[PDB]
């Protein structure tokens, strides 16, 4: 949080980062399960959009 007086901002970058990193691990994890490739495609798509 900036906290530099006044109302406080959210510096939302991390959030994307957060969710971004999230999907990454998911991808691996699901690859780690030998997932049905249709849904691995889906997760690749999620990562790309992220």
């Amino acid at each position: 949080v900036p906290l530099d007086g006044g109302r406080f901002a959210t510096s939302d970058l991390n959030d994307l980062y957060r969710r971004v990193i999230n999907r990454n691990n998911r991808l691996k994890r699901l690859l780690d399960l030998a997932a049905p490739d249709i849904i691995v495609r889906n997760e690749k798509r999620m990562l790309q959009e992220a």
């Binding site: 007086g5 109302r7 998911r26 399960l33 997932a35 049905p36 849904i39 997760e43 999620m46």
Partner: protein
């Protein structure tokens, strides 16, 4: 959406094959389908697209792993199985995120010593009151 019966069929079949590696995707497409359809349920589908994406991600992986074990002789339906599976996955994800941003609020309210005089009273009480409400749980 999709005939529950044919899903019973496909899963019986992957059972039989796992009695021998992969599984068919018919059932997997249907899983995506049912997850996304539940997403449009009424308690959810209420707040935030961005969250909802990750929610459904959670639920999908949960159903994926949890398909491993599904009796047929009992629980003659896989539909509701996956349904409640994803349901729980969702609530898990959402509680995590809620208390995360709660943590953010908590960190915030512990900093009023910025520069000089002339503080505010109105807002701070509200960050406080939320940071309390969430903490109630």
């Amino acid at each position: 959406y999709v005939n529950n019966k044919e899903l019973l069929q496909a899963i019986i079949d992957w059972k039989t094959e796992l009695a021998n590696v992969r599984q068919n995707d018919t059932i997997g497409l249907a899983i995506m389908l049912i997850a996304e359809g539940l997403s449009k349920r009424f308690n959810f589908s209420g707040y935030t697209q961005s969250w909802k994406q990750e929610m459904i991600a959670d639920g999908i992986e949960a159903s994926i792993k949890g398909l491993h074990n599904f009796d047929e002789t009992k629980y003659k339906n896989p539909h509701a199985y996956i349904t409640q599976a994803c349901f729980n996955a969702f609530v898990q994800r959402i509680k995590k995120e809620r208390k995360e941003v709660a943590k953010k609020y908590s960190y915030f309210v512990h900093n009023v010593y910025d520069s000089r005089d002339d503080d505010m009273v109105a807002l701070v009480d509200e960050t406080f009151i939320q940071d309390i409400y969430d903490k109630m749980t």
